[PDB]
Design a protein around this ligand. Structure first.
Ligand SMILES: CCOc1cc(C(=O)O)cc(-c2c(C)noc2C)c1
Ligand SMILES: CCOc1cc(C(=O)O)cc(-c2c(C)noc2C)c1
Length: 117
């Protein structure tokens, strides 16, 4: 008797919340693709961040039906935020950017989630 979610249904409901993150310019730019530690010259990245996540990966998961239920989408969006908050200094542009995406997500996700209950 747990609620069931069809992937097309989940995509219709959640994709505008992902679009809200992506549209944030410039704050979304560092998050639109996986961190590349070799490019950035930060070989300790994957030692610190065990489970990388980014907006393109979440999008591909939505597009291909990999979330059974909406809380799994929330988990990935927060994995991305937490990884950035963990790795980067609080004063850093990227950390502040991350916080902006979180503030946006907070506004967008609450009414969407209630509509899925
Ligand atoms: C409100 C609908 O927003 C979108 C729809 C589609 C769609 O597939 O209809 C794709 C995107 C999207 C995102 C997120 N990141 O790159 C794109 C393109 C956003
Ligand atoms: C294409 C630019 O992508 C990034 C640039 C920088 C940058 O330092 O210019 C930092 C990150 C990043 C994120 C997001 N989470 O940890 C790091 C590092 C990503």
């Amino acid at each position: 008797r747990k609620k069931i979610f069809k992937p097309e249904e989940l995509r219709q409901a959640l994709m505008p919340t992902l679009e809200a993150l992506y549209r944030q310019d410039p704050e979304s730019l560092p998050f639109r693709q996986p961190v590349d530690p070799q490019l950035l010259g930060i070989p300790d990245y994957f030692d610190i961040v065990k489970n990388p996540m980014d907006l393109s990966t979440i999008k591909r998961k939505l597009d291909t039906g990999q979330y059974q239920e909406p809380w799994q989408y929330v988990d990935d969006v927060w994995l991305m935020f937490n990884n950035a908050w963990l790795y980067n200094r609080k004063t850093s542009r990227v950390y502040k950017f991350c916080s902006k995406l979180a503030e946006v997500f907070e506004q967008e996700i609450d009414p969407v989630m209630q509509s899925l209950g």
